[PDB]
Sequence to fold (792 residues):
Amino acid sequence: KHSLPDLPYDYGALEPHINAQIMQLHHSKHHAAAVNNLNVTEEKYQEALAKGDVTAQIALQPALKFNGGGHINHSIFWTNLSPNGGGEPKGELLEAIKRDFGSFDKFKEKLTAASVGVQGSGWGWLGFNKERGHLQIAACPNQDPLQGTTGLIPLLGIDVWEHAYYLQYKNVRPDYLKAIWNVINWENVTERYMACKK
Amino acid sequence: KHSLPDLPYDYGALEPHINAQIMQLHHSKHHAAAVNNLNVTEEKYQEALAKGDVTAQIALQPALKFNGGGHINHSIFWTNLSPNGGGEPKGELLEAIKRDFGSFDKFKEKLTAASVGVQGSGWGWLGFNKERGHLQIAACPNQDPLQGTTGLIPLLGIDVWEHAYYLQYKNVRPDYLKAIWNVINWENVTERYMACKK
Amino acid sequence: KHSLPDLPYDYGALEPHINAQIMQLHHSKHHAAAVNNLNVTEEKYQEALAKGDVTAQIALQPALKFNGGGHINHSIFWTNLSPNGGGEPKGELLEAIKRDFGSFDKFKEKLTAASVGVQGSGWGWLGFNKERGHLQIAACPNQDPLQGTTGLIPLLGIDVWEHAYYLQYKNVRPDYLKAIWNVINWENVTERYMACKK
Amino acid sequence: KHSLPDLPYDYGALEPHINAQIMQLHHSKHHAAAVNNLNVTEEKYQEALAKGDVTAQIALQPALKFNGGGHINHSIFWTNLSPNGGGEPKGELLEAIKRDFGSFDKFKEKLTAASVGVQGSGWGWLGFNKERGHLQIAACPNQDPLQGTTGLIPLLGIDVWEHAYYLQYKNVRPDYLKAIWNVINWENVTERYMACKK
Ligand SMILES: [Mn+2]
Ligand SMILES: [Mn+2]
Ligand SMILES: [Mn+2]
Ligand SMILES: [Mn+2]
Fold:
């Protein structure tokens, strides 16, 4: 049974970049609903599968991807942020960034471009392509999860759904992006990056 | 050259169902940006077309549909609302509603279901199917316009993008839907409906 | 554990409308492959679900919809055809056709249009809308099944993937569509329709 | 005003890898039809744009992408093949292949996999990423063109729509893929690649 993970920090630990109201609603309501909805959908799929009901299985895909993706994306997102985040990585991750995007600053501009470029709801991602053995930026619509839909391993995700910033920044997503860089938990992004080595 | 249409009423004319802050941002920022962006995209398409650059034409489709759809959807949305709206239609529109959905109340439940059911950004619509000669409910993702993508003629649209309600109702879209019924401008929906007769 | 259903007739029974070579390849290769692939994908989804691996479940969705839909669609298709078929349906089904589409010929033109209009691979369908209690025509891309993706109950399906007609009709899909009316098993379509009333 | 390009060789010049019947139908029917359809759709878009009819412009998008992409993709495809082709590329292109994919054989396996993996109609492509300055393999659905929908520059394309191989290879697409390597015009792929450096 899937469960809602506790936030790694208090709801106001990211102020003033992302206000506590946002953090509380985003976690206790948005992520919470996805988890309960996911459990309900998985239950239905096990029944449809046991009866070999392919039509039911197909009809349940949108709900499974949306609530499942919602759980996957937010679980990673929380760890991607930290009160002591910000600045830039150091070591292998940093070297990969410069290698694949030219410079950290260039990388920031590219991931920002992908995030701001999302038309409708979605996420901007910095991922790792195991096949190519390099970093790659990608954008996903709605709650479609990065690995489940592209195969790329998620390192850093930026939620550009309006509920992730509208209460504080309104229609100006670029202001939201500019601010979030101040809280990126590079220690966690680095750990996720190294996990792809082994 | 496309232009931003004036709101048929003041920004606070729909209180308390949709607060004035929402109305001002939604109109002066969201709809406004779409119009200017549309004009810019149309300019680019005329050039690509003149040079017979099919690749450019294809690359510009997402922007044309999104900003074009944005202009189309919001232009209709404003007229779909009114300070003196609410209640239910009377005459042919009402008879069609009962005929195709059983009862006005049933119709309200169905269009609400379609609107609340949107995963991600989108719109709920009550449209007219000229081919079948009857009413039909449909949901569209992001800014995809109803007639341009489904052929159905738009009668009543419900914006379920989070920017349309988050500041007032937060994550609870159902509360937003319940409230919007109080401001539906049935006079305009009826006019749009009759225009399909001729 | 899904199995390939025996065809209701001999591979050359639909001659000369759909030749024996196509019938044999379509059943023994295309449909058979979807069946084998479906059993494999379902087994993997069983493992994913039991492990609570949401990423794997999501990654399996395209294969499940593609191969499962393949099994669903062709199973119905075989029963929708007959060597002693053709002509027109009678009783209630025919009444509905005239009611919902105007006449039998208008219905044919509409289903043909939807079928010839498919860009890429897909299917044309005559389905029943349980919510609206009336007939409805629809087109589905690739192997996306009617009920699983639209909620509509399938009554008559027309496979417009190129393997359904190329060997005999080459690029002229309209010729295939004209010929298939000669083998439509209205007895079966009627059963599916009446099974909707109950 | 777009025109159908003459084939660079005789219809039976690619025998026995791709037979003459397929080559003739593919060029004179499939590609020719896309050209005619494209000119028609572009003319309608010219009228829509001049009128400021955003709904019509949006409604024309599927036809424009489908027929325009058809023109783009096949035009490149013809030049990607040759009767005296086959073997392997040399110089820089070959260097990049080993660099980006490991070896020529690994590249072949990867392009083949992407091509055989297309569910429904589509294309497998070897393209150049100008942003990352490296080779990249990608698959496109139906006639969606590489550059117009992915920004990648097309170097080598493989049509996996069933009309590209069914008459000769029937359902065994892998056999088609194996055979096509014998007629790849590496001279042309090289030109497209070098044209990316400048
Ligand atoms: Mn979120
Ligand atoms: Mn809006
Ligand atoms: Mn088939
Ligand atoms: Mn082709």
User: Anything to note?
Assistant: The interface with chain B takes residues 25, 29-30, 33, 62, 66, 119-122, 141-143, 161-163, 166-167, 170-171 of chain A (CB under 8 Å). The longest helix of chain A spans residues 20-50. The pocket of manganese (II) ion (ligand 3) is lined by residues C 26, 30, 74, 159, 161, 163-164 (CB under 6 Å).
